[PDB]
Structures are given as structure tokens and as C-alpha cells.
Amino acid sequence: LKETSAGYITMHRPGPHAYKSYLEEASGEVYIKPPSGKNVTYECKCGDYSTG
Amino acid sequence: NSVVVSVLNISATLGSQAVLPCKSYRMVWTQDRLNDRQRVVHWDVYSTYYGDNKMERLCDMYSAGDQRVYSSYNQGRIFMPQNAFTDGNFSLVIKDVAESDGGIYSCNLHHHYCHLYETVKIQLDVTKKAKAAKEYWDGEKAVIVALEGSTVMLPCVNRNQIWTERHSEEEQQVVHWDRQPPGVPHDRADRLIDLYASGERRSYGPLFIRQKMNITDTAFALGDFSLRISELESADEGTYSCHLHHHYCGLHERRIYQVFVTEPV
Amino acid sequence: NSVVVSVLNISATLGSQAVLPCKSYRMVWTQDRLNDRQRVVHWDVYSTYYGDNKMERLCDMYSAGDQRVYSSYNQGRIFMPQNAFTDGNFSLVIKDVAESDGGIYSCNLHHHYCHLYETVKIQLDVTKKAKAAKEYWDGEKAVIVALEGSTVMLPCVNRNQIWTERHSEEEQQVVHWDRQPPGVPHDRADRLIDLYASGERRSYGPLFIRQKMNITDTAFALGDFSLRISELESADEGTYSCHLHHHYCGLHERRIYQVFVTEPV
């Protein structure tokens, strides 16, 4: 029976995630192409921990 | 197939609010996450021979449980066949009977989940001479007469499907509020709303009428399936039916209300 | 996704023969039935302290091989973690450092099948006083200073997918010669011919043009995928693209040639 009265399992929000397709580097200069219609963050450390 | 609990004529007034009280606290659904899955039977003697003249429980069987004797003596004296729990023959056996043992016996069944209980009454007597030792049936009770110290049997069998083991999966207790369209005979209704024991509700037809067809959110729990129809319209005219079925307890009932829209007067 | 190696405008003349030199001897495919499936890394020191002032190889790791020390002493002194072969941290450890041990170190990677190799340069120095014992980074090299006999570490990590273990099935190196039809923008070509590392060639379109579209039969082997188009026609007018991809080595490149048919003048 679906009804259950035992056990206890935690549940929490997720962490960050990674991908390559967001970043394209065919040319010498960097290129980032996030999927259309989706907010995205990006980070780089050269010089400083700069994020956009 | 359900059985018509009662038929009532409802003189619902157009525009006003009408109430169909279909409900039963017996149908109430257990709130705790652990719905009771056990049933109990017991034997209790009320022997007026005792100056205390109280009722004392000889023993009790718990479903899927272990036989347990209340006192330290009835073990051996009291025999409750374990297999009989499936047979339903909840009979009692006494090895030796004393002058202080004769009295009034009662076999009782209790079930928390189904909220159904029963009791059956018997009489026991003991005499020094076996000549008068003969059972008889009084319609409302049975009288046993036997020699002192002689083995005696008291029968308690119900022969009921609910009280015999059936590990059936707990089907949600279906509740259906179905309205016969205007100018339509009974038994031809289309389900206005459906309610499950799990609390999920399936709505049919317009949403505004369902909202005005006020039903307490705890109806599946409290069992208050009474239908409160507000802002009555001519479309709502027609007979209403409140069907309830509980597979585990095996109950099946229906309430029919002749709801006709009447203009204000 | 491939990367445009170069874009060249081709003034192909009608009737004459035009050549698209898309090719790379790096792309050459191994001829022997046993294509190389192993890669090597090694460490080599060029210490000018030696009067011989030659470069001597401390040790070398072979893919799926066993650690082997060139000399009889570096064992124990030189530590190359076997698990690091998967990590790619091809670092070196010295237990004790002598005045004759300081010099120039170089970590080198060689791969016969992919024909890709790399080298990284480092400097090591030893002093009697730990006060001056401090590393520094010169951009083109790193200088290490440490006390004589002190354990020292030299890092060589590339963090590259090719140099880390990947037992991927050897997908045939796809080569595609695709021509944009006349009056069509780039990236809209239909494959004129396809070439596999196994040597099989898939022809598309007329057979006569494929025959006149001369390609060396050993192109899959030599890598000379240059396209020689003969008896140029107006139909052949349009941009040409030469795409190459090697899954095992992970290479992906494309060469675009603006081939327009020009009448003789």
C-alpha cells in the first residue's frame, strides 16, 4: 500500500552544474553561447574572480 | 451493489443554498499515517456469584498477534484455537468448572479501522447432579448446565467475511456525488464529483459550480460528504445521489435526494 | 564542432582543373595493420654542471606499461605515481639533491598514433643555505631552489582529455568533401564524397564527376584529401568544404574554399 508510516529522508536544494556547450572557443578570443531563453552565470579567474 | 440508506425529497429553492446531509461518522477515515490494520476479539464473564459482581475478561485474540491470558490460571483452562481465527469459530473451552465459575459469558468483537463491533451473550451454570445438566436456547441467550469440573464448550462464531482474514489491498473508499440532469429518472446521473480516501478529489463539469458546491475539505477524513449547493440554478435541477463504498470493510451504501429547483415564494 | 583552419578564395577556371589542397601529414593514418595504441611520457635533465653537458633521460612511463628507470640509482630517488597516469599529474620527486643534480629539467609527452608531442621546461638549483631556497616563476620556466639532500617536487601536469585514459572505440576518422550548390551560402553543402579511415569511400552525385574529381587512392592513408576537380562545369560552381574529424585524437577541423567558376580569359 502506498501509504507509509516509517522512515525519514532528507530533501534540499541542489548545487551548481557545469557544461561545455555554453562556452565556445573556436577563435582565439573567448565566446560564450548560453542556450536561448535561459538565464546563465559564468565565472573566470584570470586576474580576479570575475563573474557575469 | 449499494443499498438505499434513505430517500428524501429536497425542495431546493432557486438562488438559495441547499444541503444534502449524506455523511456518516462511521465512515470517518483514520487521520494518522498508520491506519489501523488489526482487529480484536475477547471473552468476558459477568458472574454475579462474585460479591464484586464485575465483568472480568478471560482472554483476547489480536489479529496477527499472540494468544495472551489476562490471569495466571486461565492458561490451560481456556483454549482458543489459533487456526480458528481463520475459521472464525471464536469458541471457548473450560477444562474444569467450579461453583464460582458459573455465570454470564459474553463474546465481543472490536475493530478500530472499520469501527464495527459486536457482542453475543451466553449463560453458564453448574450443578452437582448431571441429571439437570442440559443446554437450552432462550432466543436472546443460551444456558449451559454441566457437572462441576466437567469440560464445557461455549460457541462464538459469526461466519462473516469481514471478520475472516482477507489481506486485500486497501482500495480507496470511493465516494461519488452524481446528479441526474433535469427531467431525468434516477440511476442515470453523471458524476458531479468523486472523492477518494487518499484525499484526492476529481471534479466534473464547470469549476464555478464545484466551487459553489461547497464540500468540506476534510470530508474524506471526517466523512462529511454532505453536499452544499449554492446559487441554485435550473441546470442543477434533478435528483442527486451520494454513493459510498469501502472495499476493505466491504460497506456499500447510497443516499438519494429528490432535488428540484423551486422559485422563491 | 570543427574550427575553420583557413578560408581561401579559389578562382576556378571553367574547363581547366582546380586544386583544393586540404590535407595534413599530421592527419596521416598508420599503414601497418597494428595502428599504435600506446603513448609515452618521460623526464630528462640537461645539467650543464656535467662537463659532457648532454641531456639524460631520468625515466619514462609507457601507457599500459611498467615503470622502468634508465639507470640503477634513480629507483627510489625518482617516484612517478602509477595512479597519476590517469590523473595526468606526471610530476617528479627527488629524495636527495646534490650539487651535481641541479640543472635544467624537461617533461616531454610523445604519441605516435596522434603524432602529437609536448614539452615543458623547468629549472632546479641547490644551495647550502635554506635562506635562498625559494621557488620562483619566470613565465617561460620555473626555478626551484632547495637545500642539498632535501626532498623536492617538480610538477608536470597537462590536464588534457587526450593524454588521460579513454578506451574509446576507434571511430573512423570522418572526412567529408561537400560542395555548396551554385548560388548557395556556406554551411548548406551536400556531401560530394565521404572518406573513412578504413579506406572505404562513399561517392555522391554523378560518377563521372567523381572520377574527374580526382583524389589520390591513398588519401585516407597519406592524408592527402586535397580535391582535384577537372573539366570544370557551371554546376560545380559554389563553395567547397573539407571537414575532418578524428574521435580518438579528438581533432576537428574544416577548410573552406570559395570556388567560383570563371570563364577562360
3-state secondary structure C189-248: CEEEEEECCCCCEEECCCHHHHHHEECCCCHHHHCCCCEEECCCCHHHCCCEEEEEEECC
CB contact under 8 A, A3 and B33: yes
Instruction: Tell me how many helices (H) and strands (E) chain C has.
Output: 4, 18
For residue A25, the chain C residue with the least C-alpha distance is: C3
Give CA angle at B170 (B166, B173), nearest 5°: 120
Residue among C3, C5, C256 with most chain A CBs within 10 A, to mutate:
C3
Strand B18-20, strand B3-10: pairing: unpaired
Strand C68-69, strand C136-137: pairing: unpaired
- φ, ψ (nearest 5 deg) of residue B190: -110, 130
Q: How far apart are CA B39 and CA B110, in angstroms?
A: 6
Q: How far apart are CA C228 and CA B93, in angstroms?
A: 109
Q: How many residues appear in chain A?
A: 52
Cell matching residue A43:
565565472
Q: How far apart are CA C144 and CA C152, in angstroms?
A: 9
Q: How far apart are CA C248 and CA C245, in angstroms?
A: 9
Q: How far apart are CA B195 and CA B218, in angstroms?
A: 11
- φ, ψ (nearest 5 deg) of residue C124: -125, 135
Q: How far apart are CA C249 and CA C42, in angstroms?
A: 20
Q: Tally Cβ neighbours within 10 Å of residue B46.
A: 14
For residue C253, the chain A residue with the least C-alpha distance is: A26
Instruction: Report chain C's terminal Cα–Cα distance, integer Å.
Output: 40
C93: amino acid identity, one letter: V
User: Which bin fits B198, alpha (ψ -120 to 50), beta or left (φ > 0)?
Assistant: alpha
CB contact under 8 A, B169 and A5: no
Contact of C216 with C225, CB cutoff 8 Å? no
How far apart, in Å, are the Cα atoms of C247 and each of B100, B156, C63, C161, C168?
Answer: 97, 82, 19, 12, 8
Cell matching residue B157:
462464531
- φ, ψ (nearest 5 deg) of residue A34: -65, 155
Q: How far apart are CA C105 and CA C120, in angstroms?
A: 9
Q: How far apart are CA C71 and CA C67, in angstroms?
A: 12
Strand C213-214, strand C201-203: pairing: unpaired
Specify the 3-state DSSP secondary structure of B140.
coil
Contact of C249 with C116, CB cutoff 8 Å? yes
Cell matching residue B50:
462474585
Q: H or E element: which one contains C39? A: strand C39-46
Contacts of B198 in chain A (CB under 8 A): 2-3
Q: How far apart are CA B56 and CA B71, in angstroms?
A: 10
Q: Does A8 touch chain B (CB under 8 A)?
A: no
How far apart, in Å, are the Cα atoms of C37 and each of C41, C62, C65, C169?
Answer: 14, 11, 12, 11
Q: How far apart are CA C139 and CA B207, in angstroms?
A: 73
Q: How far apart are CA B122 and CA B104, in angstroms?
A: 6
Contact of C61 with C67, CB cutoff 8 Å? yes
- Backbone CA torsion sign across B84, B85, B88, B92: positive
Torsion of CA C16, C20, C25, C30, to 10 degrees: -80
Contacts of A1 in chain B (CB under 8 A): 169-170
**C3-9, long-range: CB < 8 A, 24+ apart:** C3/A26, C3/A27, C3/C252, C3/C253, C3/C254, C4/A26, C4/C254, C4/C255, C4/C256, C5/C253, C5/C254, C5/C255, C6/C255, C6/C256, C7/C256, C7/C257, C7/C258, C8/C255, C8/C256, C8/C257, C8/C258, C9/C257, C9/C258
C53: amino acid identity, one letter: N
Query: Among B53, B4, B11, B30, which residue's Cα sits nearest to residue B223?
Result: B30
Contact of C8 with C79, CB cutoff 8 Å? no
Contacts of A3 in chain B (CB under 8 A): 33, 35, 170, 198
Specify the 3-state DSSP secondary structure of C25.
helix
- Backbone CA torsion sign across C181, C187, C188, C193: positive
Q: Tally Cβ neighbours within 10 Å of residue C187.
A: 11
Share of chain B residues as helix, strand and coil, in percent rounded to the nearest 5: 10, 40, 50
The residues, ordered by sequence, that sit 6+ positions from A19 with a Cβ below 8 Å of its Cβ are: none
Positions of chain breaks in chain A, given as the residue before each break (C to N > 2.5 Å): none
Q: Which chains neighbour C (Cβ–Cβ under 8 Å, 3 or more pairs)?
A: A
Q: What residues pair up with C254 in beta bridges, in sequence order?
A: C4, C243
For residue C252, the chain A residue with the least C-alpha distance is: A26
User: Which bin fits B81, alpha (ψ -120 to 50), beta or left (φ > 0)?
Assistant: beta
DSSP string for residues in B71-135: SSSHHHHB---STHHHHTB--EEESS--TTT-EEEEEEEEETTTTEEEEEEEEEEEESSGGG---
Measured between CB atoms, which of A1, A4, A5 is closest to B170?
A: A1
Q: For B28, which DSSP code? A: P
How far apart, in Å, are the Cα atoms of C221 and each of C25, C27, C249?
Answer: 10, 9, 16
Instruction: Tell me how many helices (H) and strands (E) chain A has.
Output: 0, 4
- φ, ψ (nearest 5 deg) of residue B86: -75, -40
For residue A26, the chain C residue with the least C-alpha distance is: C3
Q: Tally Cβ neighbours within 10 Å of residue C198.
A: 10
Q: Does A7 touch chain B (CB under 8 A)?
A: no
Contact of C19 with C215, CB cutoff 8 Å? no
Secondary structure E strands in B97-239: 103-111, 116-127, 136-137, 142-147, 152-154, 174-179, 190-195, 201-203, 213-214, 227-229
Query: Among C85, C258, C78, C133, which residue's Cα sits nearest to residue C183?
Result: C258
Q: Tally Cβ neighbours within 10 Å of residue C51.
A: 6
CB contact under 8 A, A5 and B34: yes
- φ, ψ (nearest 5 deg) of residue B214: -60, 130
For residue A4, the chain B residue with the least C-alpha distance is: B33
Residue B108: CA count within 13 A, CB half-sphere = 15
- Backbone CA torsion sign across B4, B5, B11, B12: negative
Q: Do chains A and C touch (3 or more CB pairs under 8 A)?
A: yes
For residue A27, the chain C residue with the least C-alpha distance is: C3
Q: Distance between alpha carbon B182 and the CA centroid of its chain, in Å? A: 36
C25: amino acid identity, one letter: Y
The residues, ordered by sequence, that sit 6+ positions from B217 with a Cβ below 8 Å of its Cβ are: none
Q: How far apart are CA B107 and CA C100, in angstroms?
A: 104
Specify the 3-state DSSP secondary structure of B210.
helix
Q: Do chains B and A touch (3 or more CB pairs under 8 A)?
A: yes
Contact of C146 with C152, CB cutoff 8 Å? yes
How far apart, in Å, are the Cα atoms of C265 and each of A20, B63, C13?
Answer: 51, 106, 9
Query: Among B196, B222, B226, which residue's Cα sits nearest to residue B213?
Result: B226
Q: How far apart are CA C57 and CA C106, in angstroms?
A: 9
Please write down the HEC assignment for all residues of C163-197.
CCCCCCCCCCCEEEEEECCCCCCCCCCEEEEEECC
The residues, ordered by sequence, that sit 6+ positions from B104 with a Cβ below 8 Å of its Cβ are: B45, B46, B47, B48, B121, B122, B123, B124
Query: Among C168, C142, C192, C133, which residue's Cα sits nearest to residue C247?
Result: C168
Query: Among C123, C144, C121, which residue's Cα sits nearest to residue C132?
Result: C144
Q: How far apart are CA C12 and CA C225, in angstroms?
A: 18
The residues, ordered by sequence, that sit 6+ positions from C86 with a Cβ below 8 Å of its Cβ are: C164, C165
Strand B142-147, strand B116-127: pairing: parallel
How far apart, in Å, are the Cα atoms of B124 and each of B45, B53, B134, B178, C34?
Answer: 10, 15, 11, 53, 101
Q: How far apart are CA C13 and CA B218, in angstroms?
A: 87
Specify the 3-state DSSP secondary structure of A46.
coil
Cell matching residue C210:
567523381
- Is residue C53 exposed (0-12), middle (13-18) or buried (19+ Cβ within 10 Å)? exposed
CA distance, residue A6 to nearest chain B CA (Å): 9
CB contact under 8 A, B169 and A1: yes
Full strand arrangement of the beta sheet holding C174-179: C3-10, C251-259, C240-246, C174-179, C190-195, C201-203
Q: What residues pair up with B152 in beta bridges, in sequence order?
A: B94
Specify the 3-state DSSP secondary structure of B33.
coil
CB contact under 8 A, A5 and B33: yes
Query: Among C244, C178, C249, C167, which residue's Cα sits nearest to residue C1?
Result: C244
Contacts of C4 in chain A (CB under 8 A): 26
Contact of B84 with B90, CB cutoff 8 Å? yes
CB contact under 8 A, A3 and B35: yes
